[model samples]
Target: GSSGSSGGQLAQDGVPEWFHGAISREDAENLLESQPLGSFLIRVSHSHVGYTLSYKAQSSCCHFMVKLLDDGTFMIPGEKVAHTSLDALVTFHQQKPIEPRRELLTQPCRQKDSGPSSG
Candidate 1:
């Protein structure tokens, strides 16, 4: 089948390019290991029902679990604001500092891919 949709949209559920699907904790940490502070990436959680936000802080990498509400909104734990989408959540944190650590997401540490793996 695979042939009825041609609109060329709806690819990552409108999430930002920094979203990495289902990468493990170590993988996520490695991605941000040498990155500067405030660099972050959102990846699908391996165990949780939702996603995980990996942020590179001043001295360590922080993992924040992003929860999804029944109303289709996204939010970080212990936070009061609910975002409309993953991108919106990222955008919000970009301007506002994350709680406790108060680290702002200044840059997106994107996932890397090897070119042409298939034979």
Candidate 2:
């Protein structure tokens, strides 16, 4: 989760090129420490926009996407969100009561075998 343009984290395989550090792999791991993975999903949502993260599974299957926006949540012509399904992505962006612009950043998905990472 640290770096500059030239000092970027070492590129990884499978992990998307834009990961930068959002994978939440090392930011903190107590999500798994205090609670358990999946124990908090499917039954909730958060504006925290992330997890207790510190304790999440070291590797679990998750489904999500990140869509970046320009001009502050406003969808300019060239930049738009793909139909990756509505659910939370839409809920997060439909900041209507405050109908201000919001931009999605990415779409990250951890398939079936989350292998050895956190959900």
Candidate 3:
């Protein structure tokens, strides 16, 4: 995703009304296209530690947290970040093998015949 600062600035600069508050899952997805997937590193702002994994999402407009780092790496904290797609937000350590796990994925659970149903 684009630097959180840029994303936040875009929202503050009147990019979209829905972008007024903390970015949502929808907003983050939209911002991903503007950022390089390889550079999406996760970090802790105060400590400036780089996480082994990075993320991207599948939605057009998703919100994510931003934390500036000293190593020229921008960090997006995952605790509060919302993602459009699970696959976009995960990366594995290069030394490890990929494995499948139960992960969250957005699905259209609503039926045309039904107004709305609890999932």
Candidate 4:
């Protein structure tokens, strides 16, 4: 969905692209409520389009996928995945250190879109 405002949609819920880094500390924490808060695995999925950080408490092993985007806003399921996944990113930042947090937390280092893999 270009904007999810029209008829065609990008996802089932039809959430459009927005700023992931355009959030605050409280907003981030609230999103991850009721999620698995210990350890998660970071995986680069060949088939998985977005993220799969859906805490088992909220979704099936792979159904929800933890990638949320409805109404261009944050909801529990989406935010929870975002928040939890961000925590892993933060841990990566802490141990290995990610970049582009910058002066504000609202500008995470953007990953350049990659081309098709050598299938």
Q: Pick the candidate with the highest lDDT.
A: 1
**lDDT tens per residue, model 2, 4-118:** 5554344335553222233343322223233333322121214333321111333543333233343333221233443232343334333321122222222222322323543
Alpha-carbon RMSD, each predicted model? 9.4, 13.4, 15.6, 17.3
Instruction: State TM-scores per candidate.
Output: 0.78, 0.21, 0.21, 0.21
Q: By lDDT, is 1 or 3 better?
A: 1
Query: What's the alpha carbon RMSD for model 4?
Result: 17.3
Any residue pairs clashing in model 4, and if so which? 1-10, 15-69, 93-97, 93-98
* TM-score (C-alpha) between model 3 and the true structure: 0.21
Q: For candidate 1, lDDT tens digit of each residue in 8-104? A: 3334344455777668778889888867778899888758677887789887898788888888888888887879877888888898876766888
Let me know the TM-score candidate 1 reaches against the reference structure: 0.78
| Model 2: CA > 4 A from native | 1-24, 39-65, 74-119
lDDT against the true structure, each candidate: 0.77, 0.30, 0.30, 0.29
Q: Is candidate 1 or candidate 2 better by TM-score?
A: 1
Pairs of residues at least 3 apart in sequence or in different chains that clash in candidate 1: none
Model with the higher TM-score, candidate 1 or 4:
1
For 1-119, candidate 4 gives per-residue lDDT tens digits of 24454543233332222223233333333333422332222222235344432212222222223343453322224222223343443333333311211111222221122224322
